[model samples]
Target: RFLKVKNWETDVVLTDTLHLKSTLETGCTEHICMGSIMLPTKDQLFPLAKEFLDQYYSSIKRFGSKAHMDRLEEVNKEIESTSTYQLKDTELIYGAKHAWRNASRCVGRIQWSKLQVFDARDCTTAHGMFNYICNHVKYATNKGNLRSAITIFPQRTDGKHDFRVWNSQLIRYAGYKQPDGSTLGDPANVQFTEICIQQGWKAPRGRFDVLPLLLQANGNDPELFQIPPELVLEVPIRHPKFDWFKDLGLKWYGLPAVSNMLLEIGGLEFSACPFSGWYMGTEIGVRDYCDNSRYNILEEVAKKMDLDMRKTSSLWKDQALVEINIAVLYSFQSDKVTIVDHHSATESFIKHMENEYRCRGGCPADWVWIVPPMSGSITPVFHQEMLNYRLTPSFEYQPDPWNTHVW
Candidate 1:
């Protein structure tokens, strides 16, 4: 029931249940696992290019029907000469879904097969990426009925000429550093907000200001694009029970599109693919609203609820957390926006795991992530065992384009 980590170089031993532990390596230190964020990319491309295509062909049952081997041979020949080969339209779509299916961090992969992949591999300019992204934002938001989608930009060519989106997500509020060492808006984005500002984005100095997008193509200098306001759908947070919650002036965007991560399918990396999935209630509720580094509204919410501030046993934070989450679910549903509560999301993950195990023999999960932010034991996943590991056709974190200097 427990997994133990022995220090390879030291006398230290770490112990925890498999439910609490997952696997990953670290940078400059071996004590902690950095699996979730800043994930560690690609080479030896041609063979895996074949392997990736083999699986895509196999998944489409091309293995049995034949012609797949010739297709693989043709692909290998192209890569042997071109450094990187192009994927067919069908293969591109399959790879996107396969990447979603293989992502260990996502609990929403039950809908992995249902993803809509938008291919923009031909996009050649910063504004070209903008047009594709705006289309994605529009389609994903769908007037509040959000959809799961991903738009693939150009593939990395010889590790140079890489395309990238500077905004972490297609839609996110900007965090501004203030005069008194205070942060306004969402604190999570302060550094990026500064980067956005350095390149002519005007900050509104408000609680939920939408940041302009920074789009980069052909490894060119980044370009700024204001998200066409009509494409963004935001829901104002209002409590169904506590009416005063509306006075807080809190709001959140409908779409959660991860823009900066690389999409690795069969050794080929798409440097600027943005994928959108609807939110889990507690993401906007517990983590975003209550984390000390984020919006950090727990104490304010607890105070407004007349909750006991002095004692941990008062469970004041728990009650406020639930109310905030309830409002998120309530508001999103009321506005016809797609949002899944943690309980429902986690339960569906269990179903996803069962299918994954049957389909692929096993699935990796970072338990610390798969578990809901609030209410751990109450959720079924908290009681289950999860093993984390790297897999192909996966989304991966890449170095920020700004720091990379060129490509």
Candidate 2:
């Protein structure tokens, strides 16, 4: 089982002296329980799970799946028929707006390096108190808006002032080890794999941007100070919405799954994978692909054409699945993990993936790489919010009551 720091009283004790009556809540720290529950190993589970999903697809293709299939088929047809030439034109406008909004959000001012989540006593700070209340809110709320509100910003300004981005850097997945696909562990000393998924490209963007402008701003070259490397990012494969193969009813066996299963079983323990998602500029590449035709064509249609462009949007949707978002994203933040001196317990795990997992080609391959994000670490947890930190190794199996009755 995972262990967390026990410091509820300490925070209260300090606040007590200050005559603060309200109690402080701790952040919702999720620890992956190390013990087993007599389930399949990740390797064994993935194939069966894939096959299970295949059965779902086959069944969907089979007789009983007709109801859902018909609905989907009808929806697809409607999408195909209604979306046409004008839609592509609209897509550019829509896409540009989306990119602009993203670019705007990318301009952040929170600096994590300046704040801390815990005091020397490891007690929570005012920021940590807020962290706890939100964590409690999230634990109690549903997976939808209720809980999401705890994390997601309500408005543009809400994001700017809210702790959504601020608290990320303060919290550490201390007990959180890297996934099997990371370079976190020592090969020779790697009794088991503990890759740090939190340190991926996206995780650091908050930290990148949150840095003091002095650090991020370049004295020699002001342009370097303009935008961080990972801000303008790109995604390599299709973003599920435009997955050509999946849409064509293709089997997806080769891609990663260990992480996916944990998500399904409500067992996210040891489930984080840094390589799963590509980062902007670092792993994925982002460029401004729009040209003059993009803007001119839209203006021309808006003024010269006086038709219901919505009907013509059908073509654009079809053309869009793959090509539309070619330049969709203007900025993005990578995932992050705590920087512990576990001596490459994190780095080794990532390296292992690069070596163990071979690509379709013969040569050794690098794990999916993306451009690093802007200045911040992307970890927004406040320094004073954390009560404790730990990383323990453990295993699980059927308990004695059930173990004795094994079939």
Candidate 3:
């Protein structure tokens, strides 16, 4: 019989003895554990290689079939010998594109094929990682026209001191919990905020302080580097209709570069892959700013809008939610920072579905995530059924960095 064991401190769950053994042996750091799943063996390499070859080589001038087969043989042999393999520049670029294409949770997969992949696999130092990431931040921010991009570090080979980026995103606000039980900024970042303080980072006076990049190179002590303000593009929240909303002092960064997720391709795990796309406004306005556990500003906005809050039928919360999202859309547009509204984002995803339907047989998506939280029925994705399934050579959520002793 399988028994459940939970790590309440970090919220990691180990259901069986096998999972515990793998967790202990592998030092899996993810909040949601990947149990003792089989690593990609040699058998799985050829299919992915063929897929990459067909897609990448097809674009260029054709090479002899025999030469292509010989190269595939060499790649397979290299993987067997070193336990570490390298992807060509074209392959890396296409791999990142495919990874994004296979990302089930993202609503912006319409731009999957356009992602810029930066290869930073040779950089082994903490300083080197910081420099590459800062460059990535600068490039993706694009002075406001945020671009979809990813920077990949060395893969985890033989479990020999894996490298990892500790922040959930490259840019995020620090949440300070006061003595009176109120959170000063973003509650989502409270844990990360504590880590920054412990790592000798000076705490900011205000709640909306951008946290530094915390990087762990080969299981060593994590290094901290503050992102230059000039490189970061921040949007000051302001309503298009209401003048009073500007006084709320709310704001957020432009690019949504996720630093903590694992990028798995052909069974090799890249723990330090940071990728980004421009924001979908509701992700900030509705979830980040208005969720009960987060900033919880819906009630405050309702008060300012002068909506009757006493009756649920009054739809005060709903009205405030719409305006908040409208403010996010307007602010980003006014700042010239790239952002997509839920309606437009869903429409793009619909086209993306048609694109996938024509290119591949079907597209995999999670309905719960694909549907916008605020305006569920109004969006096209709400009515459409999405088939959720795992595809190989994909991007996945890994364990949170601070939750584990090992990197």
Give per-model TM-scores: 0.90, 0.16, 0.86
RMSD values, in order shown: 5.9, 29.6, 9.2
Tens-place lDDT digits, model 2, residues 157-241:
1111211121111111112124545322112112211112221212232201211101001111111011222322212222323
Model 3 gets an lDDT of 0.78
Evaluate residue 72 in candidate 1 and report its C-alpha lDDT on the 0 to 100 scale.
80
Ranking by TM-score: 1, 3, 2
Error in Å for residue 164 of model 3: 0.7
Q: lDDT score, residue 28, model 2?
A: 27
> What is each predicted model's overall lDDT from 0 to 1?
0.83, 0.21, 0.78
lDDT of 1 by residue, 1-407 (tens): 55543323333344433222222232323576655654442247776787787778778777845588788878777877777788888989988998888787888889998899999988999999999999999988888877899999989886678899988888899898889898899898999999888888888888898999899888888899998898899999999889899988899988999998999887788999999989999899988899999999998999889988899999998889999999999999999999999889988997777666656656667687888888988887877776676667778888877888653
Model 3 clash pairs are 30-399, 31-399
lDDT of candidate 3 over 1-407, digit per residue (tens): 33343333334433332222111122234475333333315566556655556545544545556766676777778867865567777767767787788776789999887888889989888899999998999988888988888999988875557788998889998988889888888888888888889889998747789988898887677999988888888889998879999999899889898888888764567889999889899999999989999989998999998899999998999999999999999999999999999999998997787666556645666676888988888887776655555664677777776776553
- Show model 1 residue runs off by greater than 4 Å: 1-43
